[PDB]
Amino acid sequence: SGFRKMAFPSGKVEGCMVQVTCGTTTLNGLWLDDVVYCPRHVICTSEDMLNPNYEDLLIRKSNHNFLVQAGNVQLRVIGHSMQNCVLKLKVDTANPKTPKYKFVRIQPGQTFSVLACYNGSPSGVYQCAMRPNFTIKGSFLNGSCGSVGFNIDYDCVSFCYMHHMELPTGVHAGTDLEGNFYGPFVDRQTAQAAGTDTTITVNVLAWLYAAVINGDRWFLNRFTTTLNDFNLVAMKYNYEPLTQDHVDILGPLSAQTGIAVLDMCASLKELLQNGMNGRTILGSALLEDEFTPFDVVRQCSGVTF
Amino acid sequence: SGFRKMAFPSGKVEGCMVQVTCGTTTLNGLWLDDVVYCPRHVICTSEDMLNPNYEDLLIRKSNHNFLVQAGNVQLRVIGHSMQNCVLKLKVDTANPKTPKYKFVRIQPGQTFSVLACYNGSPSGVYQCAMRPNFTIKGSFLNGSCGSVGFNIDYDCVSFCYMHHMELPTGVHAGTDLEGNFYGPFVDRQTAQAAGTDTTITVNVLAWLYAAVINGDRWFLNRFTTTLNDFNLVAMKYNYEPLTQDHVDILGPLSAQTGIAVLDMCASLKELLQNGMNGRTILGSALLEDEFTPFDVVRQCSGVTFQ
Numbered sequence: 001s002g003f004r005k006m007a008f009p010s011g012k013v014e015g016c017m018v019q020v021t022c023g024t025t026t027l028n029g030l031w032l033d034d035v036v037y038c039p040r041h042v043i044c045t046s047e048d049m050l051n052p053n054y055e056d057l058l059i060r061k062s063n064h065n066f067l068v069q070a071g072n073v074q075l076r077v078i079g080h081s082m083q084n085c086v087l088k089l090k091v092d093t094a095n096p097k098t099p100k101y102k103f104v105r106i107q108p109g110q111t112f113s114v115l116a117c118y119n120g121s122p123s124g125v126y127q128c129a130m131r132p133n134f135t136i137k138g139s140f141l142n143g144s145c146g147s148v149g150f151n152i153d154y155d156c157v158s159f160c161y162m163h164h165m166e167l168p169t170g171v172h173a174g175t176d177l178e179g180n181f182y183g184p185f186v187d188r189q190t191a192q193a194a195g196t197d198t199t200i201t202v203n204v205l206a207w208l209y210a211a212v213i214n215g216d217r218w219f220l221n222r223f224t225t226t227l228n229d230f231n232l233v234a235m236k237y238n239y240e241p242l243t244q245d246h247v248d249i250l251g252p253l254s255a256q257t258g259i260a261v262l263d264m265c266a267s268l269k270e271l272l273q274n275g276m277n278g279r280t281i282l283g284s285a286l287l288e289d290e291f292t293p294f295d296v297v298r299q300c301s302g303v304t305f
Numbered sequence: 306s307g308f309r310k311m312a313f314p315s316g317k318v319e320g321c322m323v324q325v326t327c328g329t330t331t332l333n334g335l336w337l338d339d340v341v342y343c344p345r346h347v348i349c350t351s352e353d354m355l356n357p358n359y360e361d362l363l364i365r366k367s368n369h370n371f372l373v374q375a376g377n378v379q380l381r382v383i384g385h386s387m388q389n390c391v392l393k394l395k396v397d398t399a400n401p402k403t404p405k406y407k408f409v410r411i412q413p414g415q416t417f418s419v420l421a422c423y424n425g426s427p428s429g430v431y432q433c434a435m436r437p438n439f440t441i442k443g444s445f446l447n448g449s450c451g452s453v454g455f456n457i458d459y460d461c462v463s464f465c466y467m468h469h470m471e472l473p474t475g476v477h478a479g480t481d482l483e484g485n486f487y488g489p490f491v492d493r494q495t496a497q498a499a500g501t502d503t504t505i506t507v508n509v510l511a512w513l514y515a516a517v518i519n520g521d522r523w524f525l526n527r528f529t530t531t532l533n534d535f536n537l538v539a540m541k542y543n544y545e546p547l548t549q550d551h552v553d554i555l556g557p558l559s560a561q562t563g564i565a566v567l568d569m570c571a572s573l574k575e576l577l578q579n580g581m582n583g584r585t586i587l588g589s590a591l592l593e594d595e596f597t598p599f600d601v602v603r604q605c606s607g608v609t610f611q
């Protein structure tokens with residue numbers, strides 16, 4: 001019993017975190033095989049960030065301008081190249097702690113664990129969701145750039161996020177490990193804002209199934225709904241549309257609890273229109289949307305890595 | 306910016322998790338140096354659990370009755386002893402992944418990270434607090450026994466909890482790493498129940514200071530309170546009493562934000578009376594009590610967002 005916001009075990013990623021310094025700027029890098037990946041803005045001074053020409057700034061740097069520290073060991077940079085908004089520093093040593101890994105780009109609503117780092121040292125691990133507006137509500141201070149987000153499927157670490165910046169509302173923006181930003185953001189000190197966000201409907205339904213599995217049923221009702229009627233209600237409360245793919249993905253949880261997906265949708269529709277009436281679900285007075293259907297099955301089944 | 310329920314990176318503990326089997330029972334063990342620590346109930350059958358005589362059950366076991374698996378490698382058990390509710394299995398190999406560590410017994414309200422494990426393999430990491438009633442609200446299934454709670458301040462892992470059981474309300478009970486239970490619980494299947502739980506007041510105040518540091522002030526008010534008047538109100542909402550030690554502990558956060566501890570107490574009294582009226586504090590519609598004053602200072606910036 002119990003249901004917690006649970007991150008993947010971070011050990012496989014901790015063994016990849018390094019400190020990258022270029023001039024006065026220090027941030028985190030991800031060391032996989034003989035390459036260290038980090039945000040390309042490590043080469044910028046605060047003035048450069050106003051309007052940077054990254055290729056021009058990079059052409060002025062030599063390998064010795066990048067100091068990479070892995071624990072208390074300096075790695076030798078033997079090459080440097082840029083791929084989108086990520087800088088790739090070739091080093092003379094392959095990381096002996098390199099796990100089985102892949103680079104994956106996730107979709108909004110997908111969750112991942114963030115290993116927050118400062119000066120190449122892991123400080124904490126927390127579970128995030130990629131918001132529908134492509135930001136993450138992370139917890140990051142100055143020096144956290146280069147911290148990564150990941151999932152684990154079996155013994156393979158799928159790296160999906162690298163931290164780049166904080167937007168004025170305190171939310172965060174970053175890229176996949178190929179340097180492509182999530183969302184319409186750019187790596188420059190210019191006016192940028194997170195768009196209006198929406199709730200991840202399939203994730204709320206998954207969390208309602210988790211509540212039922214854990215003995216909370218007060219919100220269940222005798223009603224069902226059509227997918228079209230639910231989606232009209234979802235649009236009204238800034239909830240993401242629920243697709244037939246989402247309904248299919250919720251199939252296992254629906255079969256385990258005996259509550260059809262559209263039956264759970266009728267519970268959610270009532271919760272939106274009426275609220276919780278002083279009640280809580282899994283110790284929350286808000287509908288939680290940062291657990292995917294897979295997260296719920298994994299936690300409630302005890303999957304290990 | 307931002308404020309998340311954040312666990313310590315679990316790598317240093319993952320490299321210590323092993324599987325311990327005794328007969329038909331399999332659970333997790335913590336391998337540090339040449340010793341594997343695990344709940345002593347690994348020697349019980351389900352039947353033995355009502356009134357087990359652990360001394361009598363253990364004397365009947367030899368070293369070869371304990372199978373310890375670290376990854377795909379069987380460790381050889383060369384000794385066994387019981388310390389309170391923990392079984393200590395001496396093994397012939399020191400764990401090369403043993404981090405700098407210590408054993409610490411924590412007090413209610415303290416927080417820690419839990420690395421939930423099954424069959425010696427880590428499944429997930431989450432943040433917990435030792436409730437005032439000495440239970441923890443974990444996420445644990447059958448086979449999770451032996452999973453540990455810890456803090457990693459500096460490069461030293463302080464192990465503070467080992468999971469032993471789930472109580473009928475779905476909450477969890479365990480011991481420190483010396484095998485002493487937290488709370489009035491026993492490692493028996495006898496009728497046991499968690500006492501009435503209460504909110505960790507000092508932690509709620511710490512979290513209100515985190516909200517102020519992150520720019521949220523809507524809940525502040527022009528009032529202050531005496532410590533005694535605060536406790537008379539707070540106790541009516543099943544909040545733990547706030548002691549002068551708690552007021553002292555909140556001093557740094559009080560100095561950083563410019564809000565005196567008793568002034569923040571008056572804000573808490575008003576929140577208990579009014580609720581949030583559709584508003585949230587740090588993305589929560591309830592008052593959060595699983596962040597200590599130490600956690601807030603570690604997570605938050607040294608500069609308040611005035």
Ligand SMILES: CN1CC[C@@H](C(=O)Nc2cncc3ccccc23)c2cc(Cl)ccc21
Nearest residue numbers: 041140141142144164165166187188189306
């Ligand atoms: C102007 N500026 C600041 C430094 C860096 C930035 O956002 N860094 C930070 C990241 N995460 C949390 C922070 C919390 C407080 C301060 C900085 C934080 C950055 C990066 C880009 Cl791509 C563009 C601009 C910019």
Ligand SMILES: CN1CC[C@@H](C(=O)Nc2cncc3ccccc23)c2cc(Cl)ccc21
Nearest residue numbers: 001346445446447449469470471492493494
């Ligand atoms: C009767 N019984 C059951 C097995 C074990 C126990 O509590 N195991 C479990 C632990 N954590 C979560 C669980 C979730 C579902 C099931 C078991 C769980 C245990 C241990 C002691 Cl010390 C006393 C009694 C007892």
Ligand SMILES: [Cl-]
Nearest residue numbers: 275276286287
């Ligand atoms: Cl609601």
Ligand SMILES: [Cl-]
Nearest residue numbers: 252293294297
């Ligand atoms: Cl599934």
Ligand SMILES: [Cl-]
Nearest residue numbers: 410411412415
């Ligand atoms: Cl303590």
